[PDB]
């Protein structure tokens, strides 16, 4: 079924186009444990994040083939879909690098 291929700590954000500001995903400020899940049977991937403190799901988005993953900084990465821009503010450079690596692995399978 769903296999986690990476676990990283990051604050999930979404971009507020109008106010030109990033806002906490799910409106819940704080860090989340973010996984990239590989659905073995369907061979599809998705990013899922839950708040570290209360486990609330803040992000659950598919990773489509061709996705352009941008590593804005050493600790902030982002990507988008037709509706919004997602951003991950990692708890550390190590968290960012490992997540980026897993994303590239997922994209290698998709592309």
């Amino acid at each position: 079924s769903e296999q986690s291929i990476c676990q990283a700590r990051a604050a999930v954000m979404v971009y507020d186009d109008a106010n030109k500001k990033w806002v906490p995903a799910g409106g819940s400020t704080g860090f989340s444990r973010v996984h990239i899940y590989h659905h073995t049977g369907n061979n599809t991937f998705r990013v899922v994040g839950r708040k570290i403190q209360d486990h609330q799901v803040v992000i659950n988005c598919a990773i489509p083939k061709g996705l352009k993953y941008n590593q804005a900084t050493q600790t902030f990465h982002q990507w988008r879909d037709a509706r919004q821009v997602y951003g991950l503010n990692f708890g550390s450079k190590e968290d960012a690098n490992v997540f980026a690596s897993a994303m590239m692995h997922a994209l290698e399978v998709l592309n």
Partner: peptide, 5 residues
Amino acid sequence: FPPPP
């Protein structure tokens, strides 16, 4: 993409 935080 928009600028980071």
